[PDB]
Design a protein around this ligand. Structure first.
Ligand SMILES: C[C@H]1SC(N)=N[C@](C)(c2cc(NC(=O)c3cc4c(cn3)OCCO4)ccc2F)[C@H]1F
Lengths: 113, 362
């Protein structure tokens, strides 16, 4: 199984702004896969953002993003999403998807005034 | 995560080292065998004989079925189970739940013989029905913000410790010696030489890495390929000096009893290649680890067809670090590996590898 993942939708935003990240999946049964967003900024530790179960009903979040970010998926289109609202400077990082020990190259999110 | 809270988190000897795991909403507590030789998180789903409790999926509000089964078959036995997803809590080490895949066993043959599930900690490659089924440790590493490292100590030769996320300094004294992981499926490492009481066996080092030499917490004995096993038996018998053992002792069909002279039995050293290929280090087990009490004793080494399995016989002497991040397995001598005021394991090095070949794996 070659778990292929490609993230998109990152950008440079102001404080209190918004982004919708997406991740396209191929090479595996996306509809049966647990999906997770992770973030990594330079000089900082790896930080789990959110995980979503395969049918989409079970979602978990880090306390740092709770109430601001929402994870979701469209299994028919093999796409994972992260809606990001009320963005803060401390959310600045590369956001990437992971599944079964594989990850995508990620998408840059930058929050600056 | 808190590594000190994970000290003494395993129970058993014996019959396997198991971790207490809480599954579902509300949580159901299960006793789970720590197994570095497999990659599925699988638990009992039905009553069965030989188990007290089991995971009832219908009592978990957060459980979700994937809508497919998985059948795993071994040499001796097998099982079949429903594949699902649910929240899991490890109370000894973590204070948050994690979403993981789970196989709930509804039938088996020669599988359940104190634990009621297995926690496969090997790589994605071995996961069934495919490597796309995210393993427990891959879920934990990501969701818990821990390093891609775990370490294991077995104190049954006193439970043990599974430190998920790193190394706990209080579990060892002396240096950690690292050997490369040759292939990421099982924890396959390179064995260069076997030595019985100072004497090297006269075998090609390819005989030790037949299909593979692996570090497996889910195997009880030191399993050796038949040719290597025959050579070890001959070397132990020659070095013992006292009146000879039965053939039944070697093959496991008979116990050797005394009202025992540990001085009369030799040490067994396994040489492993260092991260620098010019050097090696040896992990040594004393007689007390391979002449195992059942005073009557059974032989702690057995034959195999495929694979040299470094099982619990050896792992009970050492704090073993499964450093997946740096593609290496660490070894240090266990302070708890002590019987009758004598350390039953040793580690030492460096030693030259100039005699042996550069790649002992075929
Ligand atoms: C063939 C085995 S090897 C394998 N790696 N895993 C599977 C998943 C498997 C393993 C076991 N093992 C044990 O119960 C057991 C007991 C021990 C012990 C170690 N392991 O060391 C200390 C003393 O007692 C049992 C069933 C089982 F299916 C299989 F792949």
């Amino acid at each position: 199984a070659q778990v292929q993942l490609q993230e998109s939708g990152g950008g440079l935003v102001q404080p209190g702004g918004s982004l919708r990240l997406s991740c396209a999946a191929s090479g595996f049964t996306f509809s049966s896969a647990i999906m997770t967003w992770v973030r990594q900024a330079p000089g900082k530790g790896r930080e789990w953002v959110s995980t979503i179960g395969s049918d989409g009903s079970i979602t978990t979040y880090a306390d740092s993003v709770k109430g601001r970010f929402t994870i979701s998926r469209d299994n028919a289109r093999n796409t994972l999403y992260l809606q990001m609202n009320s963005l803060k400077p401390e959310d600045t990082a590369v956001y990437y998807c992971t599944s079964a020990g594989r990850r995508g190259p990620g998408t840059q999110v930058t929050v600056s005034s | 995560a808190n590594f000190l809270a994970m000290v003494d988190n395993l129970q058993g000897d014996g019959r396997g080292y198991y971790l207490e795991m809480l599954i579902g909403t509300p949580p159901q507590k299960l006793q789970i065998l720590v197994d570095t030789g497999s990659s599925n998180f699988a638990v009992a789903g039905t009553p069965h004989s030989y188990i007290d409790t089991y995971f009832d999926t219908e009592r978990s509000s957060t459980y979700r079925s994937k809508g497919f089964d998985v059948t795993v078959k071994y040499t001796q036995g097998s099982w079949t189970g429903f594949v699902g997803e649910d929240l899991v809590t490890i109370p000894k080490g973590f204070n948050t739940s994690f979403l993981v895949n789970i196989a709930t066993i509804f039938e088996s043959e020669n599988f359940f013989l104190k634990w009621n599930g297995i926690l496969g900690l090997a790589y994605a490659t071995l996961a069934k029905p495919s490597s796309s089924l995210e393993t427990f440790f891959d879920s934990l590493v990501t969701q818990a913000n821990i390093p891609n490292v775990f370490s294991m100590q077995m104190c049954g030769a006193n439970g043990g410790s599974l430190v998920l996320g790193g190394i706990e300094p209080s579990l060892y004294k002396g240096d950690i010696w690292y050997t490369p992981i040759k292939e990421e499926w099982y924890y396959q490492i390179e064995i260069l030489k076997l030595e019985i009481g100072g004497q090297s066996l006269n075998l090609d080092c390819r005989e030790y890495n037949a299909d593979k030499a692996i570090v497996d917490s889910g195997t009880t004995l030191l399993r050796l390929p038949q040719k290597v096993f025959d050579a070890v038996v001959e070397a132990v018998a020659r070095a013992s000096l006292i009146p000879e053992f039965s053939d039944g002792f070697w093959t496991g069909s008979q116990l050797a009893c005394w009202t025992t002279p540990w001085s009369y039995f030799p040490k067994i050293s396994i040489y492993l290649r260092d991260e620098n290929s010019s050097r090696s280090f040896r992990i040594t087990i004393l007689p007390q680890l391979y002449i195992q009490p059942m005073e009557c004793y059974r032989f702690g080494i057995s034959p195999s067809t495929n694979a040299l399995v470094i099982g619990a016989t050896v792992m009970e002497g050492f704090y073993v670090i499964f450093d997946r991040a740096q593609k290496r397995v660490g070894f240090a001598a266990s302070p708890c590996a002590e019987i009758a005021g004598a350390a039953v394991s040793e580690i030492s090095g460096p030693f030259s590898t100039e005699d042996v070949a550069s790649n002992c794996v075929p």
